[PDB]
Design a protein around this nucleic acid. Structure first.
Lengths: 150, 86, 184, 129, 81
RNA sequence: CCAACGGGGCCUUU
């Protein structure tokens, strides 16, 4: 079930059984690696890059066509972001809700939802400190978070 | 059920359900035994020659009896195309 | 030539097949380009039912992707020159032993060198033109195992007659029984 | 939040056996499950069984022959000394002369009678009768 | 009911199940070759595309996203790849 | 002699 609600949905992708490229596909690995780097210079995230290749080109899965996952390809070229993108999006959401509450102090519902978002930040940041992709003593706090994303 | 000298010491050995291997107790009054006549090559029933099945009260009460009997009869020669494994 | 197309030339059967490479490389201007860089390391003859034998050819794994461009034709040709043989190409792979609790430490064992992983790759190479679409393992009441491998019903005619030879080859390399099936 | 893959598997087998079915499917598999089933198979409580590959921990289909009364897991896996084995069999098994308690030992997974011949001990897994 | 073959389900009954509940998982989407009415340039499109895929030669649009499968534009021709 | 149960060594990429 969901982490913060009673929802029980099961929708997801279902990747194929076969672990090698489909017979109709015929670009080179080097060709698609060049595309990936091209979009990254343009500022897209790994999630967004994967979508474009899926439906504008033949690329079913980058890990099957090339040898590697998209996040590793970018890191091997010096394009890695300072913080992981999923943590980035959580902080971005929290900022916008906190802005809304500056005008609407009566909105009891928004106050409740803010506490849930911030709990997800702490649980995720604690993970990244353990595997040391964030430095130790990195800490989320309400005032400085605005500048961190902006 | 045998003593140390190798003598049998049971009162009796119970029947077992041909559908599910369960023991048929001495008071399962819902259980039944079916006899199917063997057929001569001229097409007439032979007296006193039977194919026999036994079914427990549990199976009959649950309504599985008819489907089970189709399966048993078809792996003997008694039926042709009534039951399907899929 | 021969000792320069073998990675070593210790024995005569490899010399026979090495010659066939040099011959075929001349018979077509196309093969003169494609075949030139290829080399193979060893050959083993495995006897199978019906009196036939399997020419198991062992290839350096970093070059294996090259042979896949020329493995058709080559099989056509070699099975003419060596009448009454089945030819199959296999990459040579290391396998490293599992560390014991007593052993002194060594660099961490890469997952591709595990015994389970290597045997899976062997099976993938045997049926090369076709893809494997599924597997099953049967545990018989007698206490022994059989694998079933399911093949894609595509271009199977290239291997359709060899299946019994594959069973014998795989058993020699591993001791394991397999059977092949082709879903409609 | 599956806390024990072994507990789920034996629960599925019990429920099928009670209703009289001849086959059952269990998901996921594991090395421990395979070892446990092989012991049950050796003594004749189940038929053959078959493993399906899917790149995702696989599945098993088991044939049932109607001989099984119960199987079950003991949780936690208590430590067992050789002098203690006699107490567990008194509590769990229905008679002195059939049924088995199953142990993990550094000599492998085995029933309690083989463990006496080899003179080893370890931790309890479950029981069959 | 009590006896049935779990290893060899019929093709018809398998086709109607949910994609995660078949004996082995797998997708049911696919890819298309698509041509605009003007250019010769073929392009490949995913049947559940989320982006509005343009042609390569020019900013004519081939499909638009929906809640499910993508809607191909009028005048396009396609072949299932 | 032969059957079961226990145990050691060597080969098979070790």
């Amino acid at each position: 079930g969901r982490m913060h609600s009673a929802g029980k949905g099961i929708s997801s992708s279902a990747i194929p059984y076969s672990r090698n490229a489909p017979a109709w596909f015929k670009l080179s690995s080097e060709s698609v690696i060049e595309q990936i780097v091209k979009y990254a210079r343009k500022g897209l995230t790994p999630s967004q890059i994967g979508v474009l290749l899926r439906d504008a080109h033949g690329v079913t899965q980058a890990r099957v066509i090339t040898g590697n996952k998209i996040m590793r390809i970018l890191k091997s070229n010096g394009l890695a972001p300072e913080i992981p993108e999923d943590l980035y999006y959580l902080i971005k959401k929290a900022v916008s809700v906190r802005k809304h509450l500056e005008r609407n102090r009566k909105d009891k519902d928004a106050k409740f939802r803010l506490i849930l978002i911030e709990s997800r930040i702490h649980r995720l940041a604690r993970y990244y400190r353990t595997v040391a992709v964030l430095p130790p003593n990195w800490k989320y706090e309400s005032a400085t978070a605005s500048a961190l994303v902006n | 059920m045998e003593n140390d000298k190798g003598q049998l010491v049971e009162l009796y050995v119970p029947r077992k359900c041909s559908a599910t291997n369960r023991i048929i107790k001495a008071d399962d009054h819902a259980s039944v035994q079916i006899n199917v006549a063997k057929v001569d090559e001229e097409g007439r029933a032979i007296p006193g020659e039977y194919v026999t099945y036994a079914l427990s009260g549990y199976v009959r009460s649950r309504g599985e009896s008819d489907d089970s009997l189709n399966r048993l009869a078809q792996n003997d020669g008694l039926l042709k195309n009534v039951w399907s494994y899929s | 030539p021969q000792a320069k197309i073998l990675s070593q030339a210790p024995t005569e059967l490899e010399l026979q097949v090495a010659q066939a490479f040099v011959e075929l490389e001349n018979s077509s201007p196309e093969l003169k380009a494609e075949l030139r860089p290829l080399q193979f390391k060893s050959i083993r003859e495995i006897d199978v039912a019906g009196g036939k034998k399997a020419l198991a050819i062992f290839v350096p794994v970093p070059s294996l992707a090259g042979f896949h461009k020329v493995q058709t034709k080559l099989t056509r040709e070699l099975e003419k020159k060596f009448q009454d043989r089945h030819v199959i190409f296999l990459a040579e792979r290391r396998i490293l032993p599992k560390p014991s609790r007593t052993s002194r430490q060594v660099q961490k064992r890469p997952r591709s060198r595990t015994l389970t992983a290597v045997h899976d790759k062997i099976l993938e190479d045997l049926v090369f033109p076709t893809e494997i679409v599924g597997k099953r393992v049967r545990y018989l009441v007698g206490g022994n195992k059989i694998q079933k491998v399911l093949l894609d019903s595509k271009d199977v005619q290239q291997i359709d007659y060899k299946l019994e030879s594959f069973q014998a080859v795989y058993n020699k390399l591993t001791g394991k029984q397999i059977v092949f099936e082709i879903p409609s | 939040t599956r806390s024990s893959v072994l507990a789920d598997a034996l629960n599925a087998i019990n429920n099928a056996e009670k209703t009289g079915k001849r086959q059952v499917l269990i998901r996921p598999s594991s090395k421990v499950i395979i070892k446990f089933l092989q012991v049950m198979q050796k003594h004749g409580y189940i038929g053959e069984f078959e493993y399906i590959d899917d790149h995702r921990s696989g599945k098993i289909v088991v044939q049932l022959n109607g001989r099984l009364n119960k199987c079950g897991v003991i949780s936690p896996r208590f430590n067992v000394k050789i002098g203690d084995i006699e107490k567990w069999t008194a509590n769990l098994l229905p008679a002195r002369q059939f049924g088995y308690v199953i142990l993990t030992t550094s000599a492998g997974i085995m029933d309690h009678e083989e463990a006496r011949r080899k003179h080893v001990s370890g931790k309890i897994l479950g029981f069959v009768y | 009911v009590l006896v049935q073959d779990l290893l060899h389900p019929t093709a018809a009954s398998e086709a109607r199940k949910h994609k995660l509940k078949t004996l082995v998982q797998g997708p049911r989407s696919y890819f298309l070759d698509v041509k605009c009415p003007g250019c010769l340039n073929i392009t490949t499109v995913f049947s559940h595309a989320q982006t509005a895929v343009t042609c390569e030669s020019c900013s004519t649009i081939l499909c638009t996203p929906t809640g499910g499968k993508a809607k191909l534009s009028e005048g396009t021709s396609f072949r299932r790849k």
